[PDB]
């Protein structure tokens, strides 16, 4: 990414940072409604059925913050994220077993929610820059997954 692309990424991300939990809820609900098989990975809250139930769930709201806190720290490294990716790849490859396809689904949900909430900060410029940043994340985590023996 260019420096200007990174800045577009971080500018919209500052919006997310004003209310991380609410953004996390909207992203995870989007992911689970669009790709329900992904919900199966979350043993604590895989029984949830309705949008209202998902919004009321403390565990889901915690999970959304967990994701976005880690992702935000990754984005802020502007591609220099090997040290932050290392523990994430370790758990997601060997413990949780999250295939790349699911990381594509959550990337799609992130993009969907940013476009829905912050369209003035998410025009084609910013969309394209966030797409690149999330693609780079997936490329690099996929290489780490393979290093660890997981072809997911
Ligand atoms: C942007 C992508 C993601 C980030 C940054 C992220 C980050 C995190 C972090 C920081 C944790 C806690 C520490 C750890 O266990 O590594 C975690 C746990 C977990 N993640 Fe992710 N994650 C991502 C995507 C996904 C997806 C798409 C799924 C499932 C479809 C998933 C499933 C899980 C599960 C099952 C746990 C264990 C939670 C528990 O049972 O307490 N993650 N993730």
PDB file of C-alpha atoms and ligand atoms in Angstrom:
ATOM      1  CA  UNK A   1       0.000   0.000   0.000  1.00  0.00           C
ATOM      2  CA  UNK A   2       1.050   3.599  -0.473  1.00  0.00           C
ATOM      3  CA  UNK A   3       1.269   5.898   2.457  1.00  0.00           C
ATOM      4  CA  UNK A   4      -1.874   7.675   1.258  1.00  0.00           C
ATOM      5  CA  UNK A   5      -3.727   4.321   1.163  1.00  0.00           C
ATOM      6  CA  UNK A   6      -2.599   3.591   4.721  1.00  0.00           C
ATOM      7  CA  UNK A   7      -3.833   6.975   5.787  1.00  0.00           C
ATOM      8  CA  UNK A   8      -7.253   6.327   4.274  1.00  0.00           C
ATOM      9  CA  UNK A   9      -7.359   3.017   6.163  1.00  0.00           C
ATOM     10  CA  UNK A  10      -6.454   4.644   9.465  1.00  0.00           C
ATOM     11  CA  UNK A  11      -8.790   7.598   8.970  1.00  0.00           C
ATOM     12  CA  UNK A  12     -11.877   5.372   8.691  1.00  0.00           C
ATOM     13  CA  UNK A  13     -10.454   3.109  11.458  1.00  0.00           C
ATOM     14  CA  UNK A  14     -10.499   6.101  13.832  1.00  0.00           C
ATOM     15  CA  UNK A  15     -14.270   6.014  13.391  1.00  0.00           C
ATOM     16  CA  UNK A  16     -14.352   2.386  14.479  1.00  0.00           C
ATOM     17  CA  UNK A  17     -12.262   3.330  17.530  1.00  0.00           C
ATOM     18  CA  UNK A  18     -14.993   5.693  18.803  1.00  0.00           C
ATOM     19  CA  UNK A  19     -17.126   2.665  19.565  1.00  0.00           C
ATOM     20  CA  UNK A  20     -15.278  -0.532  19.086  1.00  0.00           C
ATOM     21  CA  UNK A  21     -17.907  -2.772  20.688  1.00  0.00           C
ATOM     22  CA  UNK A  22     -20.761  -1.540  18.561  1.00  0.00           C
ATOM     23  CA  UNK A  23     -18.781  -1.923  15.387  1.00  0.00           C
ATOM     24  CA  UNK A  24     -17.779  -5.374  16.495  1.00  0.00           C
ATOM     25  CA  UNK A  25     -21.319  -6.381  17.062  1.00  0.00           C
ATOM     26  CA  UNK A  26     -22.415  -5.202  13.678  1.00  0.00           C
ATOM     27  CA  UNK A  27     -19.493  -6.989  11.974  1.00  0.00           C
ATOM     28  CA  UNK A  28     -19.929 -10.266  13.730  1.00  0.00           C
ATOM     29  CA  UNK A  29     -23.716 -10.256  13.220  1.00  0.00           C
ATOM     30  CA  UNK A  30     -23.156  -9.496   9.540  1.00  0.00           C
ATOM     31  CA  UNK A  31     -20.660 -12.381   9.309  1.00  0.00           C
ATOM     32  CA  UNK A  32     -22.923 -14.857  11.125  1.00  0.00           C
ATOM     33  CA  UNK A  33     -26.101 -13.910   9.149  1.00  0.00           C
ATOM     34  CA  UNK A  34     -24.198 -14.049   5.852  1.00  0.00           C
ATOM     35  CA  UNK A  35     -22.182 -17.183   6.580  1.00  0.00           C
ATOM     36  CA  UNK A  36     -23.874 -19.089   9.381  1.00  0.00           C
ATOM     37  CA  UNK A  37     -21.374 -21.917   9.360  1.00  0.00           C
ATOM     38  CA  UNK A  38     -18.837 -19.452  10.874  1.00  0.00           C
ATOM     39  CA  UNK A  39     -20.897 -19.171  14.052  1.00  0.00           C
ATOM     40  CA  UNK A  40     -20.149 -22.851  14.729  1.00  0.00           C
ATOM     41  CA  UNK A  41     -16.591 -21.970  15.675  1.00  0.00           C
ATOM     42  CA  UNK A  42     -17.658 -19.953  18.700  1.00  0.00           C
ATOM     43  CA  UNK A  43     -18.672 -22.552  21.284  1.00  0.00           C
ATOM     44  CA  UNK A  44     -19.849 -19.978  23.813  1.00  0.00           C
ATOM     45  CA  UNK A  45     -22.424 -18.472  21.625  1.00  0.00           C
ATOM     46  CA  UNK A  46     -23.002 -20.800  18.679  1.00  0.00           C
ATOM     47  CA  UNK A  47     -26.644 -21.348  19.850  1.00  0.00           C
ATOM     48  CA  UNK A  48     -27.687 -17.764  19.052  1.00  0.00           C
ATOM     49  CA  UNK A  49     -30.508 -17.498  16.469  1.00  0.00           C
ATOM     50  CA  UNK A  50     -31.945 -13.956  16.159  1.00  0.00           C
ATOM     51  CA  UNK A  51     -30.378 -10.592  15.579  1.00  0.00           C
ATOM     52  CA  UNK A  52     -31.797  -9.412  18.897  1.00  0.00           C
ATOM     53  CA  UNK A  53     -30.222 -12.360  20.693  1.00  0.00           C
ATOM     54  CA  UNK A  54     -26.891 -11.562  19.037  1.00  0.00           C
ATOM     55  CA  UNK A  55     -27.158  -7.914  20.080  1.00  0.00           C
ATOM     56  CA  UNK A  56     -27.973  -8.888  23.677  1.00  0.00           C
ATOM     57  CA  UNK A  57     -25.087 -11.371  23.991  1.00  0.00           C
ATOM     58  CA  UNK A  58     -22.236 -10.239  26.266  1.00  0.00           C
ATOM     59  CA  UNK A  59     -19.996 -12.992  24.865  1.00  0.00           C
ATOM     60  CA  UNK A  60     -20.577 -11.929  21.244  1.00  0.00           C
ATOM     61  CA  UNK A  61     -19.922  -8.268  22.180  1.00  0.00           C
ATOM     62  CA  UNK A  62     -16.627  -9.321  23.882  1.00  0.00           C
ATOM     63  CA  UNK A  63     -15.647 -11.370  20.829  1.00  0.00           C
ATOM     64  CA  UNK A  64     -16.215  -8.426  18.511  1.00  0.00           C
ATOM     65  CA  UNK A  65     -13.930  -6.229  20.630  1.00  0.00           C
ATOM     66  CA  UNK A  66     -11.325  -9.006  20.746  1.00  0.00           C
ATOM     67  CA  UNK A  67     -11.228  -9.092  16.916  1.00  0.00           C
ATOM     68  CA  UNK A  68     -11.221  -5.351  16.318  1.00  0.00           C
ATOM     69  CA  UNK A  69      -8.593  -4.586  19.007  1.00  0.00           C
ATOM     70  CA  UNK A  70      -6.204  -7.055  17.329  1.00  0.00           C
ATOM     71  CA  UNK A  71      -7.048  -5.986  13.807  1.00  0.00           C
ATOM     72  CA  UNK A  72      -6.593  -2.314  14.631  1.00  0.00           C
ATOM     73  CA  UNK A  73      -3.172  -2.939  16.066  1.00  0.00           C
ATOM     74  CA  UNK A  74      -2.287  -4.843  12.874  1.00  0.00           C
ATOM     75  CA  UNK A  75      -3.535  -2.056  10.568  1.00  0.00           C
ATOM     76  CA  UNK A  76      -1.581   0.589  12.524  1.00  0.00           C
ATOM     77  CA  UNK A  77       1.685  -1.318  11.639  1.00  0.00           C
ATOM     78  CA  UNK A  78       1.039  -0.427   7.937  1.00  0.00           C
ATOM     79  CA  UNK A  79       2.155  -3.875   6.745  1.00  0.00           C
ATOM     80  CA  UNK A  80       4.995  -4.298   9.231  1.00  0.00           C
ATOM     81  CA  UNK A  81       2.895  -6.738  11.207  1.00  0.00           C
ATOM     82  CA  UNK A  82       4.836  -9.997  11.378  1.00  0.00           C
ATOM     83  CA  UNK A  83       5.059  -9.886  15.180  1.00  0.00           C
ATOM     84  CA  UNK A  84       1.373  -9.305  15.617  1.00  0.00           C
ATOM     85  CA  UNK A  85       0.441 -11.925  13.075  1.00  0.00           C
ATOM     86  CA  UNK A  86       2.633 -14.585  14.671  1.00  0.00           C
ATOM     87  CA  UNK A  87       0.447 -15.356  17.767  1.00  0.00           C
ATOM     88  CA  UNK A  88      -2.732 -14.904  15.750  1.00  0.00           C
ATOM     89  CA  UNK A  89      -1.735 -17.371  13.096  1.00  0.00           C
ATOM     90  CA  UNK A  90      -0.601 -19.810  15.825  1.00  0.00           C
ATOM     91  CA  UNK A  91      -4.012 -19.949  17.492  1.00  0.00           C
ATOM     92  CA  UNK A  92      -6.183 -19.595  14.466  1.00  0.00           C
ATOM     93  CA  UNK A  93      -4.264 -22.347  12.557  1.00  0.00           C
ATOM     94  CA  UNK A  94      -3.671 -24.903  15.322  1.00  0.00           C
ATOM     95  CA  UNK A  95      -6.429 -24.323  17.908  1.00  0.00           C
ATOM     96  CA  UNK A  96      -9.463 -22.678  16.368  1.00  0.00           C
ATOM     97  CA  UNK A  97      -8.830 -23.894  12.809  1.00  0.00           C
ATOM     98  CA  UNK A  98     -10.140 -20.855  10.911  1.00  0.00           C
ATOM     99  CA  UNK A  99      -9.737 -21.333   7.193  1.00  0.00           C
ATOM    100  CA  UNK A 100      -8.766 -18.531   4.872  1.00  0.00           C
ATOM    101  CA  UNK A 101     -12.238 -18.584   3.363  1.00  0.00           C
ATOM    102  CA  UNK A 102     -13.606 -17.479   6.755  1.00  0.00           C
ATOM    103  CA  UNK A 103     -11.051 -14.678   6.972  1.00  0.00           C
ATOM    104  CA  UNK A 104     -12.372 -13.609   3.583  1.00  0.00           C
ATOM    105  CA  UNK A 105     -15.930 -13.673   4.958  1.00  0.00           C
ATOM    106  CA  UNK A 106     -15.013 -11.483   7.962  1.00  0.00           C
ATOM    107  CA  UNK A 107     -13.114  -9.128   5.721  1.00  0.00           C
ATOM    108  CA  UNK A 108     -16.310  -8.787   3.604  1.00  0.00           C
ATOM    109  CA  UNK A 109     -18.358  -8.088   6.712  1.00  0.00           C
ATOM    110  CA  UNK A 110     -15.866  -5.411   7.933  1.00  0.00           C
ATOM    111  CA  UNK A 111     -16.054  -3.711   4.548  1.00  0.00           C
ATOM    112  CA  UNK A 112     -19.850  -3.959   4.516  1.00  0.00           C
ATOM    113  CA  UNK A 113     -20.177  -2.348   7.971  1.00  0.00           C
ATOM    114  CA  UNK A 114     -17.699   0.458   7.240  1.00  0.00           C
ATOM    115  CA  UNK A 115     -19.495   1.294   4.019  1.00  0.00           C
ATOM    116  CA  UNK A 116     -22.903   1.217   5.788  1.00  0.00           C
ATOM    117  CA  UNK A 117     -21.837   3.426   8.704  1.00  0.00           C
ATOM    118  CA  UNK A 118     -19.170   5.760   7.287  1.00  0.00           C
ATOM    119  CA  UNK A 119     -19.828   6.225   3.562  1.00  0.00           C
ATOM    120  CA  UNK A 120     -18.245   9.713   3.426  1.00  0.00           C
ATOM    121  CA  UNK A 121     -15.012   8.126   4.775  1.00  0.00           C
ATOM    122  CA  UNK A 122     -15.474   5.081   2.593  1.00  0.00           C
ATOM    123  CA  UNK A 123     -15.639   6.112  -0.972  1.00  0.00           C
ATOM    124  CA  UNK A 124     -13.845   4.271  -3.725  1.00  0.00           C
ATOM    125  CA  UNK A 125     -10.492   5.522  -2.565  1.00  0.00           C
ATOM    126  CA  UNK A 126     -10.883   4.264   0.963  1.00  0.00           C
ATOM    127  CA  UNK A 127     -12.697   1.089  -0.033  1.00  0.00           C
ATOM    128  CA  UNK A 128      -9.897   0.202  -2.336  1.00  0.00           C
ATOM    129  CA  UNK A 129      -7.215   0.976   0.309  1.00  0.00           C
ATOM    130  CA  UNK A 130      -9.080  -1.148   3.021  1.00  0.00           C
ATOM    131  CA  UNK A 131      -9.530  -3.973   0.518  1.00  0.00           C
ATOM    132  CA  UNK A 132      -5.761  -3.939  -0.105  1.00  0.00           C
ATOM    133  CA  UNK A 133      -4.950  -3.836   3.618  1.00  0.00           C
ATOM    134  CA  UNK A 134      -7.249  -6.778   4.425  1.00  0.00           C
ATOM    135  CA  UNK A 135      -5.943  -8.716   1.401  1.00  0.00           C
ATOM    136  CA  UNK A 136      -2.349  -8.191   2.656  1.00  0.00           C
ATOM    137  CA  UNK A 137      -3.418  -9.451   6.130  1.00  0.00           C
ATOM    138  CA  UNK A 138      -4.942 -12.598   4.554  1.00  0.00           C
ATOM    139  CA  UNK A 139      -1.928 -13.213   2.254  1.00  0.00           C
ATOM    140  CA  UNK A 140       0.522 -12.968   5.115  1.00  0.00           C
ATOM    141  CA  UNK A 141      -1.553 -14.990   7.576  1.00  0.00           C
ATOM    142  CA  UNK A 142      -1.998 -17.716   4.861  1.00  0.00           C
ATOM    143  CA  UNK A 143       1.772 -18.023   4.536  1.00  0.00           C
ATOM    144  CA  UNK A 144       2.102 -18.304   8.308  1.00  0.00           C
ATOM    145  CA  UNK A 145      -0.696 -20.931   8.429  1.00  0.00           C
ATOM    146  CA  UNK A 146       1.278 -23.057   5.931  1.00  0.00           C
ATOM    147  CA  UNK A 147       4.470 -22.631   7.960  1.00  0.00           C
ATOM    148  CA  UNK A 148       2.561 -24.126  10.893  1.00  0.00           C
ATOM    149  CA  UNK A 149       1.299 -27.067   8.826  1.00  0.00           C
ATOM    150  CA  UNK A 150      -2.299 -25.791   8.286  1.00  0.00           C
ATOM    151  CA  UNK A 151      -3.545 -25.630   4.716  1.00  0.00           C
ATOM    152  CA  UNK A 152      -6.728 -23.893   5.532  1.00  0.00           C
TER     153      UNK A 152
HETATM  154  C1  LIG B   1      -9.744 -10.155  11.377  1.00  0.00           C
HETATM  155  C2  LIG B   1      -9.739 -11.447  11.720  1.00  0.00           C
HETATM  156  C3  LIG B   1      -9.577 -11.943  13.101  1.00  0.00           C
HETATM  157  C4  LIG B   1      -8.858 -11.446  14.190  1.00  0.00           C
HETATM  158  C5  LIG B   1      -7.982 -10.260  14.227  1.00  0.00           C
HETATM  159  C6  LIG B   1      -9.135 -12.354  15.265  1.00  0.00           C
HETATM  160  C7  LIG B   1      -8.576 -12.149  16.536  1.00  0.00           C
HETATM  161  C8  LIG B   1      -8.787 -12.972  17.626  1.00  0.00           C
HETATM  162  C9  LIG B   1      -8.096 -12.830  18.896  1.00  0.00           C
HETATM  163  C10 LIG B   1      -7.201 -11.708  19.259  1.00  0.00           C
HETATM  164  C11 LIG B   1      -8.551 -13.846  19.671  1.00  0.00           C
HETATM  165  C12 LIG B   1      -8.128 -14.177  21.111  1.00  0.00           C
HETATM  166  C13 LIG B   1      -6.703 -14.734  21.196  1.00  0.00           C
HETATM  167  C14 LIG B   1      -6.548 -15.962  20.275  1.00  0.00           C
HETATM  168  O1  LIG B   1      -7.193 -16.953  20.625  1.00  0.00           O
HETATM  169  O2  LIG B   1      -5.812 -15.857  19.304  1.00  0.00           O
HETATM  170  C15 LIG B   1      -9.433 -14.678  18.877  1.00  0.00           C
HETATM  171  C16 LIG B   1     -10.091 -15.844  19.308  1.00  0.00           C
HETATM  172  C17 LIG B   1     -10.883 -16.594  18.500  1.00  0.00           C
HETATM  173  N1  LIG B   1     -11.203 -16.446  17.208  1.00  0.00           N
HETATM  174 FE1  LIG B   1     -10.516 -14.938  16.045  1.00  0.00          FE
HETATM  175  N2  LIG B   1      -9.894 -13.357  14.873  1.00  0.00           N
HETATM  176  C18 LIG B   1     -10.212 -13.156  13.562  1.00  0.00           C
HETATM  177  C19 LIG B   1     -11.084 -13.979  12.808  1.00  0.00           C
HETATM  178  C20 LIG B   1     -11.806 -15.103  13.229  1.00  0.00           C
HETATM  179  C21 LIG B   1     -12.847 -15.809  12.518  1.00  0.00           C
HETATM  180  C22 LIG B   1     -13.316 -15.344  11.172  1.00  0.00           C
HETATM  181  C23 LIG B   1     -13.287 -16.773  13.373  1.00  0.00           C
HETATM  182  C24 LIG B   1     -14.391 -17.763  13.255  1.00  0.00           C
HETATM  183  C25 LIG B   1     -15.092 -17.890  12.215  1.00  0.00           C
HETATM  184  C26 LIG B   1     -12.492 -16.714  14.565  1.00  0.00           C
HETATM  185  C27 LIG B   1     -12.655 -17.564  15.656  1.00  0.00           C
HETATM  186  C28 LIG B   1     -12.082 -17.436  16.830  1.00  0.00           C
HETATM  187  C29 LIG B   1     -12.347 -18.270  17.991  1.00  0.00           C
HETATM  188  C30 LIG B   1     -13.290 -19.506  17.981  1.00  0.00           C
HETATM  189  C31 LIG B   1     -11.604 -17.809  19.010  1.00  0.00           C
HETATM  190  C32 LIG B   1     -11.638 -18.401  20.394  1.00  0.00           C
HETATM  191  C33 LIG B   1     -12.652 -17.595  21.272  1.00  0.00           C
HETATM  192  C34 LIG B   1     -13.003 -18.307  22.558  1.00  0.00           C
HETATM  193  O3  LIG B   1     -13.598 -19.460  22.365  1.00  0.00           O
HETATM  194  O4  LIG B   1     -12.770 -17.696  23.627  1.00  0.00           O
HETATM  195  N3  LIG B   1     -11.619 -15.663  14.485  1.00  0.00           N
HETATM  196  N4  LIG B   1      -9.511 -14.121  17.638  1.00  0.00           N
END
